Amino acid sequence: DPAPRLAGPPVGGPGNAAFDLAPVRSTGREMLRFDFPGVSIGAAHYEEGPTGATVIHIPAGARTAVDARGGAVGLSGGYDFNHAICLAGGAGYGLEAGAGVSGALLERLEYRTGFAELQLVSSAVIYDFSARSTAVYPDKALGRAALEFAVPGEFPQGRAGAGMSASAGKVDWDRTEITGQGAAFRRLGDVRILAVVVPNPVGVIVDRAGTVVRGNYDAQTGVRRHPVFDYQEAFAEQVPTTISAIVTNVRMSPVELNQFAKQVHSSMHRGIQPFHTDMDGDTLFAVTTDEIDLPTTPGSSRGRLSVNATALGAIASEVMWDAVLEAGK
Amino acid sequence: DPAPRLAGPPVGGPGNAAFDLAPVRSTGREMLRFDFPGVSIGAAHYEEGPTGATVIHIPAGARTAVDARGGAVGLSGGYDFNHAICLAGGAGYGLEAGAGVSGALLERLEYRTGFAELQLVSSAVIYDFSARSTAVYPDKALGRAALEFAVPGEFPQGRAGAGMSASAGKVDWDRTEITGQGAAFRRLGDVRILAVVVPNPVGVIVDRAGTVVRGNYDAQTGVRRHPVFDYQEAFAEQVPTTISAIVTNVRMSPVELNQFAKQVHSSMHRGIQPFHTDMDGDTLFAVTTDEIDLPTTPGSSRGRLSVNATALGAIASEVMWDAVLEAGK
Amino acid sequence: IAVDPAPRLAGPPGGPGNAAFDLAPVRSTGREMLRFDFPGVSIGAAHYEEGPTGATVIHIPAGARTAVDARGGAVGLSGGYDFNHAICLAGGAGYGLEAGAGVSGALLERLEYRTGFAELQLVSSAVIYDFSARSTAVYPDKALGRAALEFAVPGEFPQGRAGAGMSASAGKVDWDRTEITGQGAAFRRLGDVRILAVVVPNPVGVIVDRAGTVVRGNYDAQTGVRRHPVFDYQEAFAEQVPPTTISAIVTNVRMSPVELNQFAKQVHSSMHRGIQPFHTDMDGDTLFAVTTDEIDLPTTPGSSRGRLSVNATALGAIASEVMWDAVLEAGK
Amino acid sequence: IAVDPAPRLAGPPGGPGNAAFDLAPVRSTGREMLRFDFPGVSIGAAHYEEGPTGATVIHIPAGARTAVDARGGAVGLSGGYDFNHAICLAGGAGYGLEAGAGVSGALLERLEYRTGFAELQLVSSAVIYDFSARSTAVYPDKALGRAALEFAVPGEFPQGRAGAGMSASAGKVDWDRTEITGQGAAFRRLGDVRILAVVVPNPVGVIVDRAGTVVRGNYDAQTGVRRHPVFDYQEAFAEQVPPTTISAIVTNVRMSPVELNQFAKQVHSSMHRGIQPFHTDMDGDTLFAVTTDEIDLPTTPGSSRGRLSVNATALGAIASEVMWDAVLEAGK
Ligand SMILES: [Cl-]
Ligand SMILES: [Cl-]
Ligand SMILES: [Cl-]
Ligand SMILES: [Cl-]
Ligand SMILES: [Cl-]
Ligand SMILES: [Cl-]
Ligand SMILES: [Cl-]
Ligand SMILES: [Cl-]
């Protein structure tokens, strides 16, 4: 039962043109540290929003699967191979941050443009305008800044980057609470799994016991409700987005990687409820650096079908739940 | 903590040609009764398998969305409008049951064949051969029988129809348990929601507290395990299907219905874990009889965004969890 | 081909169904047999005279990686697997998917009822609606699918009114101008490379040759000629709004799942050259792209004819021509 | 069109990028202006001489229901929304998606920075890779997209080397045979019905006319003629294996989401008539089908020209011809 963080009602607010916007390097509430060679993370925000962008930079490039769900997807690129993933606020306007990343990467490549040297950035967005009283959005300059701020082995938890103005629980805006962004990391032997998430759900964040921990908080009661209780009573009366990434170092074929993405994404309906709704633009990127082979056969002491991409997906699903809970903390 | 129902190892077994197969009307462990005009359910099995088929008959026809996930889908038709949904065992061979339904419906239509009089049956299957020691599968005659046995307002819970030899928890077959089929029903005002499920998951059935209730039972310990505990230890050591239907009477557009299907299907990763894996052929049919309008605006005392298809999806997700728990009981 | 200019109007359309008849499968021989050299690939074609309707089965007993491309609002598909031991094409609209169950059951029996997951016999099936072209309600049933498998012959294909093509037809702006088509196949061997195309065109649109001439469908008995449907459509709009094809490519060239899928889409779209309109809401157009995984593409795509000349796209372009030839055989 | 037979080889391809230049947007006028009567639809085209590269923006301020059809292995798409206030087509490969951000930001400013979910300004963008056709690394940036919006003119389209078409090219079996294309548009009014096609063909394949003649791309300077790529591909295989197009249709006819989506697929596939090969792994082919929802189809599909003559499929067939005309304008 954490203390509430109600977003409150928005107030006609100023947009980008009204300000000389200074990027700020986001530090969040605390820094997660981890060991994942070849992966860097940067996060930048404008205090003016507040709104921001979070960039996962994999300079060598990495094979990717994208799983998009719901009626409000805001996606650019969605490539099967990426040098960066850019997550941002600002609704569709915030896809501009990824253009800032792309242009910067072209500069770093000394303006080479061979079809194979193309720098590929996939971007996804949350609508974060109800949670504040301005129209500032992540722009090209903010995406460039997030890339510039990227470093190996660090992630700023909470109100940082794309998570500045993320919020949950939207049966009614009077009960919506600020979330954040979150990350979690596990290493098993040589295997590495990093989960990054920016939950801006219509639904609420739920822990492993089934407790609603963030979103749909009623100030009249002091208690959070699972949305289904509201929905069911609404029917009886009246009749008559989360953007995320997994990054791993395990080699998976295109088909395995795509099904892994679907599996991990669906697993997030455990910690976010409802999820994958028409109201949401839920988008997960599954990224592999293609470093570690799975064994040719899937046995172990733990079972005949225990070491495969599905197994990896189950583990990664837990890392992602932990990240969602970090974002809601 | 229910008593175990381990499937045990399969034993070269006989197939359909070896028997004079008599359809049996499946009664299960108990009958669910409900009120849903225009919907009938029949279930038939062969004791010889044991294996069976469950048919949802909507004689007027109903708009449908199909959501298929994983690497082992076995689907026929997958139509956007159906007179029947046929769920069966027998792996891909059991898709034949749906042909029995289709042919019977043509007969009932007096052999009319105008493109608009076409009788549309969508079928999906589970692989149920590891859970028994024969190669008998649901054939045309069994599908016809299931249709013949269909009645309004009844569903046979447990080991009935397609659920005869369904099983869960397949990290290792020594720990796999027999499930069944399940159904649940809710009425809210005029709104009706029926969930039908045949869980044959690689994963396990999980209740709302997070307890593993069916699948991955270790006879050496007397306890069921969430598969992720096995998977994670397998990695540390070695490196280095569910078919379902919702049926409702609420009018939804094609787009709403499709997103509703996705939402409800993903919600099942709460009660089945892992879910939507490469190993699974998970297929959900969302069917509406298009009887009840939702209101033009989505408000109620419960919230400004409380009465819409997403709301319906959240409610239906709970009905489906209840059905999954019925199947595992 | 030399297409026969003569009309073959289907005519209009209280039809009897399967059990009204003592249905004996007939091995379809069509108008002519195509012979092709592609070890591992057999084709069987069976029909019921009483429809007339039929099924055509491509049997690849090793199993072969497959991509499925389905378009339009009227798809009738079973299985649609990424690996198949057989592809079953049939008449009878959705009822004719039953033929593929006949194939599946027969293959299980041939496998001595083994049911290990790696032993599952996988059949993908697709259908055309062929009831407008005849009075009956007879459809390709499980017996007919089993018969088409039993009748499969290595390296032979019956052109014309045979198997699934027995009551196929084209050009459906008005049924008075619809003509019977058939099924068709074509084959090319280029070096070591083998490409087989099989098609059962039952289009809303018409069959068009490489010169742009409409050669089958939309025959107006009042004019004696076939014109493109667009002329009828444009005249219809000016007046009233005043101010399926099922097919397979089979090749022996190794393609990854991703390459094979995009090859399928390319070849399928290429068929809008020979069938117009195509991929419509009215159509259940479904193409299966199958590779037997026998021969590698070179690791680099060069030749004397260009730096990007030997790759899956190039193979797709070649296969597209084989498919157009098959479409013209069906319409001949 | 009368296509110019003369070659326009792109030539081969250490190129400077955007900030190397003081980049002034130029309003593109192309070779000729198409004028069309479609209230609510404007087109702006802007280029940078220093590329040369550009962007073409279709501005529909009411917003319009859209279906997106994307094919191939090289798609470069932003938004891909089911409802759009603008469509932005650009060069610069994935970098040129930035032009659409310029459009989006400008539209937000025009909306006085209102951000209610029902007020969100939705821009879908798609790109061609046009860097082989020039030395520079200049790409359509946010300023260029904003300029293309600012330059939008109701009912006018600049044909040829203009906007996104400034460095578009066709026929990429070998770059030595690649020719500059352009952008193209065509428009038809039939009764009350309006159909606009816009295309930016940068294909791997070639542009083909209705007679089957290759008219742009794969020009062999050693022969003086263009032949179909398949001749090169087949010769390449015999030797070595021995024994993007971005486009939009815009119409005023009401179509449901399902009809509009299948219309998009039909029209897109129809472009394999005029662009061959098409929908290849090599291509990022993306078509936007947009309806302004002004006029109903009749409730029944009859006319004197047939019982199934007035429906979305019929509209698709008509629109397919408008699109082929646009492709030929681009290649002229
Ligand atoms: Cl929000
Ligand atoms: Cl927890
Ligand atoms: Cl199993
Ligand atoms: Cl429970
Ligand atoms: Cl027909
Ligand atoms: Cl045989
Ligand atoms: Cl190019
Ligand atoms: Cl303007």
Author numbering:
A (entry chain A), B (entry chain A): 19 to 29, 31 to 259, 267 to 355
C (entry chain B), D (entry chain B): 16 to 28, 31 to 260, 267 to 355
Copy the relevant paper text.
Three amino acid residues corresponding to the substitutions D122G, H130Y, and D36A (increasing the protein stability of NylCp2) and one amino acid residue corresponding to the substitution L137A (decreasing the protein stability) were located at the A/D interface, and the glutamate residue corresponding to the substitution E263Q was found at the A/B interface. In the G122Y130A36Q263 mutant, the acidic amino acid residue Glu263 was replaced with a neutral Gln, suggesting that the alterations in the electrostatic environment induced by the E263Q mutation contributed to improving the subunit interactions. We confirmed that the E263Q substitution in G122Y130A36 (Tm = 84 °C) increased thermostability by 4 °C9. The rmsd of the main-chain atoms between NylCp2 and NylCA and between NylCp2 and NylCp2-G122Y130A36Q263 was generally less than 1 Å, but loop 1 (positions 15–34), loop 2 (positions 88–93), loop 3 (positions 125–133), α3 (positions 246–257), loop 5 (positions 258–269), and loop 7 (positions 319–333) displayed significant structural differences. It should be noted that α1 and its adjacent loop 3 regions showed the largest structural difference between NylCA and NylCp2, whereas a difference of less than 2 Å was found between NylCA and NylCp2-G122Y130A36Q263. Wild-type NylCK and the most thermostable mutant, NylCp2-G122Y130A36Q263 (Tm = 88 °C), should exist mainly as a tetramer of αβ-heterodimers (MAV = 151,384 and 130,895, respectively). The absence of a dimer molecule suggested that the equilibrium of reactions 1 and 2 were optimized to yield tetramers as the major product, leaving monomers as a minor population.
Nylon hydrolase (NylC) is one of the three enzymes responsible for the endo-type degradation of the by-products of nylon-6 manufacture (cyclic and linear oligomers of 6-aminohexanoate (Ahx) with a degree of polymerization greater than three) and various aliphatic nylons (e.g., nylon-6 and nylon-66). However, the post-translational autocleavage of the nascent polypeptide between Asn266 and Thr267 generates an active enzyme with an α subunit (27 kDa) and a β subunit (9 kDa). Based on the X-ray-crystallographic structure of NylCA, we reported that four αβ heterodimers (molecules A-D) form a doughnut-shaped quaternary structure. In addition, we proposed that the nucleophilic N-terminal residue Thr267 in the β subunit functions as a catalytic residue for either autocleavage (from precursor to active enzyme) or substrate hydrolysis.
